[PDB]
Each structure stands twice: as structure tokens, then as C-alpha cells.
Amino acid sequence: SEQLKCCSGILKEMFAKKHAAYAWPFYKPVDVEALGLHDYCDIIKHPMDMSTIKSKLEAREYRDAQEFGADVRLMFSNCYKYNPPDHEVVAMARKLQDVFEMRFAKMPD
Ligand SMILES: CCNC(=O)C[C@@H]1N=C(c2ccc(Cl)cc2)c2cc(OC)ccc2-n2c(C)nnc21
């Protein structure tokens, strides 16, 4: 339970305006329709976003902290898989990932 509460803090920071500069692209779920990505569903089968992860935490969907990280990492994996390695969005993803990996690890046991 205590560990689960920490997840909310880490995710909350990612939404802050401190990382919003390179974490805004991970705020809402990728709209294959709005964005016009007619090849996102074929590549990405299990999509995920920060907004979704936040809702799951509110509904106590996650059992442990480990599960919470699985979704966070999956969100970045889909980006690295869909978009190319020389893509700007990729550079921003690595920045947010580092902030999550550090906080997630620095989390009190
Ligand atoms: C760029 C090729 N086609 C795309 O739409 C890829 C898409 N690319 C973008 C994107 C990123 C930066 C710019 Cl300048 C233009 C488009 C994107 C834009 C979004 O705004 C609604 C949300 C998620 C995105 N995203 C993420 C996250 N990973 N790949 C993409």
C-alpha cells in the first residue's frame, strides 16, 4: 500500500511543468485517428499513456509497484518501436524515462 502511494508521486512529477517540456507528448493516449497514424495499431498492440496509468492507480488496478513500472516502461517501448531512433520524440522519452527510473529506484522500501 505504502509503495503504491509513492507511484502517484513519481507520476505526478512527470506531469509537472518541470518535465512537461519533454513529457507533454506522453500526456494523452496517441490518437491513431486524430494524429493520422494508420500504422500505429499494426505495430503497437498494447498501447499506454500517462493519463491511462493515472486512472488505473485511482481505481486501485495495480497490485504492486512492480506492475506500475511495467506500464510506464511499456509506454516508452511503444515509442521506440513505432518512431525511429533518430526521432525527436525519442530524445524526449529518454529524458522522462531517466526521471522515472531514478525516482522509482530511489523509492523508499
Ligand atoms: C511523426 C510520425 N507520426 C506520428 O504521429 C508519430 C507520433 N508523433 C508525434 C509528434 C511529435 C512531435 C511533433 Cl513536432 C509532431 C508529432 C506525436 C504527437 C502527439 O500529439 C498529439 C502525440 C504523440 C506523438 N507521438 C509519440 C509520443 N510517439 N510517436 C508519436
From Swiss-Prot:
Tissues where this protein is expressed: Ubiquitously expressed.
Domain Bromo: 1-107
Effect listed in the UniProt record for changing Y80C: In CDLS6; likely pathogenic; reduced acetylated histone binding
Location in or out of the cell: Nucleus; Chromosome
Annotated consequence of substituting Y40C: Found in a patient with a neurodevelopmental syndrome; uncertain significance
PTM notes: Phosphorylation by CK2 disrupt the intramolecular binding between the bromo domain 2 and the NPS region and promotes binding between the NPS and the BID regions, leading to activate the protein and promote binding to acetylated histones. In absence of phosphorylation, BRD4 does not localize to p53/TP53 target gene promoters, phosphorylation promoting recruitment to p53/TP53 target promoters.
Note in the entry: JQ1, a thieno-triazolo-1,4-diazepine derivative, and I-BET, a benzodiazepine derivative, have been tested on tumors with success. Treatment with GSK1210151A (I-BET151, a I-BET derivative) has strong effets on mixed lineage leukemia and promotes myeloid differentiation and leukemia stem-cell depletion.
Entry note about domains: The NET domain mediates interaction with a number of chromatin proteins involved in transcription regulation (NSD3, JMJD6, CHD4, GLTSCR1 and ATAD5).
Family stated for the protein in its record: Belongs to the BET family.
Functional description taken from the UniProt entry: Chromatin reader protein that recognizes and binds acetylated histones and plays a key role in transmission of epigenetic memory across cell divisions and transcription regulation. Remains associated with acetylated chromatin throughout the entire cell cycle and provides epigenetic memory for postmitotic G1 gene transcription by preserving acetylated chromatin status and maintaining high-order chromatin structure. During interphase, plays a key role in regulating the transcription of signal-inducible genes by associating with the P-TEFb complex and recruiting it to promoters.
Subunit note: Interacts with p53/TP53; the interaction is direct. Interacts (via CTD region) with CDK9 and CCNT1, acting as an associated component of P-TEFb complex. Interacts with RELA (when acetylated at 'Lys-310'). Interacts (via NET domain) with NSD3, CHD4, BICRA and ATAD5. The interaction with BICRA bridges BRD4 to the GBAF complex. Interacts (via NET domain) with JMJD6 (via JmjC and N-terminal domains); the interaction is stronger in presence of ssRNA and recruits JMJD6 on distal enhancers. Interacts with NSD3. Interacts with NIPBL.
Protein name stated in the entry: Bromodomain-containing protein 4
Residues of the full protein shown: 351 to 459 of 1362
